[PDB]
């Protein structure tokens, strides 16, 4: 695949078990809509 | 301080240094919350 | 299409337009979720 | 008060109930930060 360069990762401490599963619907939330911004225009 | 236990604390990656300091905002606006919300009641 | 009942939609104030655009990504890209989240199990 | 002129407000509409008091707290967490940053410098 070699891949382009994909965007720099950061690690996030995050207090809060309840916290940390909203964090994470939101992280792969917007990471679903790159998936699809990824898509070719048109 | 001994301190209670604090929230279980969880690391999480996140892409995009932008998308970072945006969840970072959320992170620290959520924490200084808590701060005033560890205030006694009354 | 009938529809079943939506979750009940809600208003919310969002002070600068810079956090609007901001809170309106997390917005759709919870509802892109939601959207395949409404996939049929299997 | 006078007042200067606030942040543009902006109005979004939030599907479920639960996802509201979520972006609710994110809403008033930012809020608290920005009336912390409007302290003066020092």
Request: no cysteine; glycine share 10%.
């Amino acid at each position: 695949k070699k891949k382009p360069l994909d965007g720099e990762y950061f690690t996030l401490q995050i207090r809060g078990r309840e916290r940390f599963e909203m964090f994470r619907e939101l992280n792969e939330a917007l990471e679903l809509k790159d998936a699809q911004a990824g898509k070719e225009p048109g």
